[PDB]
Structure formats: structure tokens, C-alpha cells
């Protein structure tokens, strides 16, 4: 699920470390 | 307290384990791997002697910014736990460490896993709870994340951790008024991880929702928390520093030339989605984050996240070649560009995005004499055919549908102009 409009997502990216 | 780490065999040789220990916290690491190391396969069952493996590799990945490096501290993390007579806190910690490392790398599946076994190895904790909680949330399992906080809430009602979780769950699914007592309490408890901006979102936006009018107290408060840039910018995804302002005039954005083709194509642009709307309706989805009080809203989306969706640029074919002349917009990984459909008796809520990072242009393509309107901030205006509008939808702004026909706009996000080369290159997609 993507944040696009709005910030509904607990969390909107995906980490990668360093 | 005091962590007990010890075994019984572990104390016995607690001279070589605090030495290896001692050549870590003095920085030297690559001594440290090489004690550890030999500890390791001298004492093959130690978990002291392991958990130390793992916690040089860690410091290593930290000195040598190195996923992979971490990737190794990961898998001894777990060793460490595979072998005998662990003592609960080093069994704890090791398995912790593993997951919030996971989690640091993305593997968020991964670390799923550990926490569940964490549970299922500490019941009465509830911490680790909360933490499992955190774990579903962060893979899109809503529905297991707020079973395990009504079950924190069962035994401990007052954790505020598991309140303002429960409560963003709660507000997610539109059980508004539900929500706000949870995210209210779960704040004013100051118990750590509620100090978050996404609790003071919610719960403000809540509270907007429900004509609650002290949302703004909770705005202010998150403003002077840090959390948000101003009490009408209340994005959470920013780069600090950025030129901050509701309203943008093309020659302030300096996409002249994107503005410029977007103005002199415009009706091209509108056919395209015309046609769409004609005969592949079903490339316009609902709007589906939340964001309607009532109406239909639908939108037809050519870019997100820096990605041109082929198939339905088939269906805007000379848009989609018009646009990939502008990196500003096609590159522009937190933002999309899209074509938004609007009809009578909609109403959207007060709201925000989510990153500072984007700048949103609108041209108008087909628009009623009457009735539609969209504020940002505290200006309000309206669109025009083939006339291009920008906005900073990182602030609150609300829009309304009260014609007698539809209202077809082309949505186009930008970096925001001030953004390096390198800021667009590396900011991770939103
Ligand atoms: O009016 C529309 O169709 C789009 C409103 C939306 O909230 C936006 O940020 O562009
Ligand atoms: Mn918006």
C-alpha cells in the first residue's frame, strides 16, 4: 500500500540500510 | 538492571570474553573479530563468545556502512540463539538485535519472523509485543497488528505504545471518533515511541473530521514537537530547508518549459483522457486512501514513483510521449502524474501529502462554469481550461465538486525546484 495523495501508511518508503 | 549473559561454562571463562569485549569497546574491531573469532572456535557452544562475533560484525557494518557486512551480524545474531543453555537476556537481546537490524535492511518479513519467535519465547513481555505489533504493521497486516495491541490492552489498558497504535489502526479503517480517544491518551502518556508525528496526524485529522475544533491544538503541538515543518505543513517525508510556500507561479518553480507544454497541448491532453473515459473507463480507480467525505473521484495514472505504467500509457499515447521530454515530472519519484475525474457532491477532506519533496501542477481540461474549487492553506482557487495551477500539496488543502457535470483535471508532480541532482537521485521512492 503507497502513500500517493495521502499519508494513511504506518510508513510510506521501504529502507535499505546504509 | 544488570544483564545477565553468563552461562555457567561462560563464567569460567569470563577473562578471554571481557578481553575480546574490552579490544571492541576500545573500537578496535578488526582485533575484536580475530578474538571472538578464536573464542568462537575454541568454545564452539559459547553464546557470550558468539553474541561478541555478532556484535563486532555490527559495529563493522556501521564503521564500513556495509549492508552486506550486517547481513553477516544478522545471521550470527541468530546462532547465537541456536545453541545451548542461552541465558534469557542474551537470548533477548540477540534475537532484538537481529530483528531491529532486519528491519534497518528492509527485510521486514524477516524480522516478522523474529519477532514472532521472540513472543512465543517471552509471553509474559510486553514490550515484544508491541514490537510484533510494529512488526505486521510494517508489512501491511493491519488486521494481526491490531489483534496483538487489543491483546497488550487486555492485560496492560493504560500502554500508551499500544494506544496510539491501536488508535493510528483504528483511524486507518475510518472508525474515526473511535480512534481519537486512543491516539489522544496514547500521546499524553509520554510513554516512549508516542512521541511520533504520525500519532499527531491522525489524531488532529481525526478531530478536523469530526468538527472537533481543538484538531489545531494538537497541530501546534506537533509543530513545536518537531514533528511537523509548520501547523499547515504537516508532511513527515522531508528534506529540511526547502523553499516552503502554499502557492507556486510557474516562473518560482522554474518548469517554464514543462509548464509552457502542458498549456500549449492541453487539449490534446484532454482528448486522450476523454477517450479514456469513452471506452477503457476501467483505467480510472477510485481514489482509495481515505480521502472522500462523500462523492466519486477517480483517477488515471501514467507515472508513480518514477515509473511510466505501459499499459496505460497505451491509452494516452501522446501525453505520455509529450511528457517524457520532462525528466522534472517522469523522474520525480514522490509524485506521479495522473489524470483525476471529479463529479457532483464531492467533497474531500482537509488533508496533506506526504513528503515536502514534490511540487503538484494541475491543468484544468474540463471544467464547469460553477462549483469547483480547491483551497491550499488559506487561498482558495479555481482551475481553468488549459491553464496550469501549482500547489505544495505538502500543505493542508481541500477540494470541492458542486457542478452539474463532471471536472477532469491532468495531475503533474515535480521534484521540488531546490532539490540537488544527486537529493533526486537518492531519495527513496514515496
Ligand atoms: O482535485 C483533484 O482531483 C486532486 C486533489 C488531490 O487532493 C490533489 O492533491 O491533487
Ligand atoms: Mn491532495
Redesign the pocket.
Known amino acids: 500500500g503507497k502513500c500517493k495523495?495521502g499519508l494513511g501508511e504506518y510508513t510510506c518508503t521501504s529502507l535499505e540500510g546504509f | 538492571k544488570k544483564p545477565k549473559l553468563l552461562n555457567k561454562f561462560d563464567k569460567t571463562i569470563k577473562a578471554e570474553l571481557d578481553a575480546a569485549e574490552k579490544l571492541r569497546k576500545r573500537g578496535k574491531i578488526e582485533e575484536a573479530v580475530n578474538a571472538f573469532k578464536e573464542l568462537v572456535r575454541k568454545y564452539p557452544q559459547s553464546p557470550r563468545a558468539r553474541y561478541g562475533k555478532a556484535q563486532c560484525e555490527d559495529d563493522l557494518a556501521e564503521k564500513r556502512r556495509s549492508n552486506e557486512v550486517l547481513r553477516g551480524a544478522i545471521e550470527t545474531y541468530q546462532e547465537v540463539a541456536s545453541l545451548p543453555d542461552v541465558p534469557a537476556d542474551l537470548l533477548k537481546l540477540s534475537l532484538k538485535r537481529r530483528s531491529d537490524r532486519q528491519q534497518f535492511l528492509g527485510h521486514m518479513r524477516g524480522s516478522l519472523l523474529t519477532l514472532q519467535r521472540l513472543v512465543q519465547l517471552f509471553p509474559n513481555d510486553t514490550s515484544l509485543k508491541n514490537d510484533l505489533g510494529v512488526g505486521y504493521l510494517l508489512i501491511g497486516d493491519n488486521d494481526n497488528a491490531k489483534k496483538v495491541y487489543e491483546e497488550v490492552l487486555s492485560v496492560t489498558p493504560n500502554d500508551g505504545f499500544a494506544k496510539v497504535h491501536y488508535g493510528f489502526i483504528l483511524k486507518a479503517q475510518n472508525k474515526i471518533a473511535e480512534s481519537i480517544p486512543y491516539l489522544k491518551e496514547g500521546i499524553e502518556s509520554g510513554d516512549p515511541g508516542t512521541d511520533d508525528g504520525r500519532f499527531y496526524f491522525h489524531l488532529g485529522d481525526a478531530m478536523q473530521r469530526v468538527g472537533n475544533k481543538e484538531a489545531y491544538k494538537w497541530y501546534e503541538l506537533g509543530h513545536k514537537r518537531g514533528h511537523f515543518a509548520s501547523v499547515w505543513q504537516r508532511s513527515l517525508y522531508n528534506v529540511n530547508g526547502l523553499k516552503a510556500q502554499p502557492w507556486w507561479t510557474p516562473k518560482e518553480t522554474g518548469y517554464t518549459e514543462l509548464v509552457k507544454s502542458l498549456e500549449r497541448n492541453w487539449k490534446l491532453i484532454r482528448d486522450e483522457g476523454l477517450a479514456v473515459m469513452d471506452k477503457a473507463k476501467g483505467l480510472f480507480l477510485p481514489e482509495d486512501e481515505n480521502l472522500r467525505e462523500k462523492g466519486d473521484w477517480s483517477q488515471f495514472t501514467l507515472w508513480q514513483q518514477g515509473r511510466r505504467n505501459e499499459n496505460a500509457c497505451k491509452g494516452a499515447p501522446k501525453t505520455c510521449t509529450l511528457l517524457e521530454k520532462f525528466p522534472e515530472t517522469t523522474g520525480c519519484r514522490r509524485g506521479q502524474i495522473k489524470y483525476s475525474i471529479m463529479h457532483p457532491g464531492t467533497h474531500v477532506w482537509p488533508?496533506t501529502?506526504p513528503t515536502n519533496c514534490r511540487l503538484r501542477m494541475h491543468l484544468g481540461l474540463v471544467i464547469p462554469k460553477e462549483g469547483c474549487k480547491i483551497r491550499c492553506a488559506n487561498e482558495t482557487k479555481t482551475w481553468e481550461e488549459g491553464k496550469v495551477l501549482i500547489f505544495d500539496?505538502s500543505f493542508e488543502?481541500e477540494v470541492w465538486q458542486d457542478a452539474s457535470s463532471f471536472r477532469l483535471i491532468f495531475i503533474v508532480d515535480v521534484w521540488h525546484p531546490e532539490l540537488t541532482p544527486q537529493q533526486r537521485r537518492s531519495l527513496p521512492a514515496i
Open positions: 495523495d | 488533508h501529502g500539496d488543502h
